[PDB]
């Protein structure tokens, strides 16, 4: 599923993404826009073997099991392949805790470099939330 940017925004904030950790709305809309374009169905393999999967292009090498890429931890307990739903619940929960981790939201490199320090509220603007 692709996502509307309102679309999104209204379901990451259903979700409690909203200032999850200090994050605002806007920069989990802006993390998404550039990790996947609001495509859960993304997928990019790695150089090290590992996949980045969904919305929020969550790693296989830690977060989630794929089968293939040794020495995985999945740490989010979950088949890769769950973070591809249109329902975004699974791909939520395991970003809450991949944001927790200690990095905060510097772990996704689109976010990092082209959201940090950015007016980030221009993601939401014109949304009913």
Same mark, same amino acid.
């Given at each position: 599923?692709?996502?509307?940017?309102?679309?999104?925004?209204?379901?990451?904030?259903?979700?409690?993404? !909203?200032?999850?950790?200090?994050?605002?709305? @806007?920069?989990?809309?802006?993390?998404?826009?550039?990790?996947?374009?609001?495509?859960?169905?993304?997928?990019?393999?790695?150089? !090290? @073997?590992?996949?980045?999967?969904? #919305?929020?292009? #969550?790693?296989?090498?830690?977060?989630?099991? !794929?089968?293939?890429?040794?020495?995985?931890?999945?740490?989010?307990?979950?088949?890769?392949?769950?973070?591809?739903?249109?329902? #975004?619940?699974?791909?939520?929960?395991?970003?809450?805790? #991949?944001?927790?981790?200690?990095?905060?939201?510097?772990?996704?490199?689109?976010?990092?470099?082209?959201?940090? @320090?950015? !007016?980030?509220?221009?993601?939401?603007?014109?949304?009913?939330?």
């Amino acid at each position: 599923k692709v996502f509307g940017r309102c679309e999104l925004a209204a379901a990451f904030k259903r979700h409690g993404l !909203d200032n999850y950790r200090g994050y605002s709305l @806007g920069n989990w809309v802006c993390a998404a826009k550039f990790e996947s374009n609001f495509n859960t169905q993304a997928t990019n393999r790695n150089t !090290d @073997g590992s996949t980045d999967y969904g #919305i929020l292009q #969550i790693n296989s090498r830690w977060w989630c099991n !794929d089968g293939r890429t040794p020495g995985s931890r999945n740490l989010c307990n979950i088949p890769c392949s769950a973070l591809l739903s249109s329902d #975004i619940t699974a791909s939520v929960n395991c970003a809450k805790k #991949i944001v927790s981790d200690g990095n905060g939201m510097n772990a996704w490199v689109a976010w990092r470099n082209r959201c940090k @320090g950015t !007016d980030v509220q221009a993601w939401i603007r014109g949304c009913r939330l």
